């Protein structure tokens, strides 16, 4: 929850032991009280300008949550926070050395370093590992 946005990547993994600062917990403690049924204690009393906007607000709260669970769901990394993969890093993506990425770098600058290359990494996890391991697992159950 953005408390370490000026910290470094080699140090922000220390405070990330809290559940991304209880990231998703702020949603459930919100939608317990977003679903205060005073909206149902009125039926909004009409259709109003705000309730049009709240309806377009809750949808984005639904969709953009799902696009982050699905991508974690497909990567063999459902529900975890720090998982490793089988994909080898290609040095053509970034010729930065080891410590400069971790000890000597922010996060948002590192986004603009590989925002070009990000989409290639997405395919190169699924079709390289999570499509792939499931067949090789199923072969190991053939016996």
């Amino acid at each position: 929850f953005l408390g370490a946005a000026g910290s470094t990547m080699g140090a922000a993994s220390m405070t990330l032991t809290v559940q991304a600062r209880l990231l998703l917990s702020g949603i459930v403690q919100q939608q317990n009280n977003l679903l205060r049924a005073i909206e149902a204690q009125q039926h909004l009393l009409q259709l109003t300008v705000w309730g049009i906007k709240q309806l377009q607000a809750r949808v984005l709260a639904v969709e953009r949550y799902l696009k982050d669970q699905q991508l974690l769901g497909i990567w063999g990394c459902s529900g975890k926070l720090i998982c490793t993969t089988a994909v080898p890093w290609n040095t053509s993506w970034s010729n930065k050395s080891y410590n400069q990425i971790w000890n000597n770098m922010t996060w948002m600058e590192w986004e603009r370093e590989i925002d070009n290359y990000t989409s290639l990494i997405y395919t190169l996890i699924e079709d390289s590992q999570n499509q792939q391991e499931k067949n090789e697992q199923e072969l190991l159950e053939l016996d």
């Epitope: 070009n116 290359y117 989409s119 290639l120 997405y122 395919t123």
Partner: antibody
């Protein structure tokens, strides 16, 4: 920066030479290149283009299949090899850099196909000249 | 695609404004949000130099009196108070797709 060529001159039909454009200071693997052909007393004709990673090559239809281009990002060179020469290829060749920077290839999600962006030119080399005659 | 221009010869003297337009067959508007038409100038006996890259922006070492505009098909480059060293040619160059062509190059004396 500095941008010239080499290997120019005059040859016969059916021959084959290769020029050599050399850049000076900018990071050469970052940028794509081009080739243009100004005929004497005429306008300009586009010839060729290479990607920055030397993977994408697009030729003109008239000189399709005959010529050859390549890169060497370490040696910062730029080659235009040519084959099956004709007399109407006698003109001024110019080495030229893209104006903007280019990125890496894009890979649209919906179809597994990359995309190399291509935009026009700012730095024309003064260029050699090849003449095809007897 | 095809893209020619007009007029070929404008033999003038300094002190007056004029304009050179390049006419487009295929309309140009790429999906990035811009129209890839590049206007630039050679001198006689010289490799050319960039006047303006886009029809909006300019390049370094360019006088302020070099203005350009146009629709997706109409395209116009206007030179206010045409300067004494405006000799040579003026090519209109597009960058839609391949093969990317040119104009003939309008001679200005």
């Amino acid at each position: 920066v500095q941008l010239v060529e080499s290997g120019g001159g005059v040859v016969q039909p059916g021959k084959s030479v290769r020029l050599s454009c050399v850049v000076s200071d900018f990071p050469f693997s970052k940028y794509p290149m081009y080739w243009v052909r100004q005929a004497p007393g005429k306008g300009l004709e586009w010839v060729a283009a290479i990607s920055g990673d030397a993977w994408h090559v697009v030729y003109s239809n008239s000189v399709q299949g005959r010529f050859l281009v390549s890169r060497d990002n370490v040696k910062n060179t730029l080659y235009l090899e040519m084959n099956s020469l004709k007399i109407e290829d006698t003109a001024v060749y110019r080495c030229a850099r893209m104006f903007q920077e280019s990125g890496p290839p894009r890979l649209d999600r919906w179809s597994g196909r990359n995309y190399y962006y291509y935009s026009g030119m700012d730095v024309w080399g003064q260029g050699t000249t090849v003449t095809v005659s007897s | 695609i095809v893209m020619t221009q007009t007029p070929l010869s404008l033999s003038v003297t300094p002190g007056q404004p004029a304009s050179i337009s390049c006419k487009s067959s295929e309309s140009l508007r790429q999906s990035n949000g811009k129209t890839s038409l590049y206007w630039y100038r050679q001198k006689p006996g010289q490799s050319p130099q960039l006047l303006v890259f886009e029809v909006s922006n300019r390049f370094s070492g360019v006088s302020d009196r070099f203005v350009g505009s146009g629709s997706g098909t109409d395209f116009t480059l206007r030179i206010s108070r045409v300067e004494a060293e405006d000799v040579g040619f003026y090519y209109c160059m597009q960058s839609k797709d391949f093969p990317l062509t040119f104009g003939g190059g309008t001679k200005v004396d």
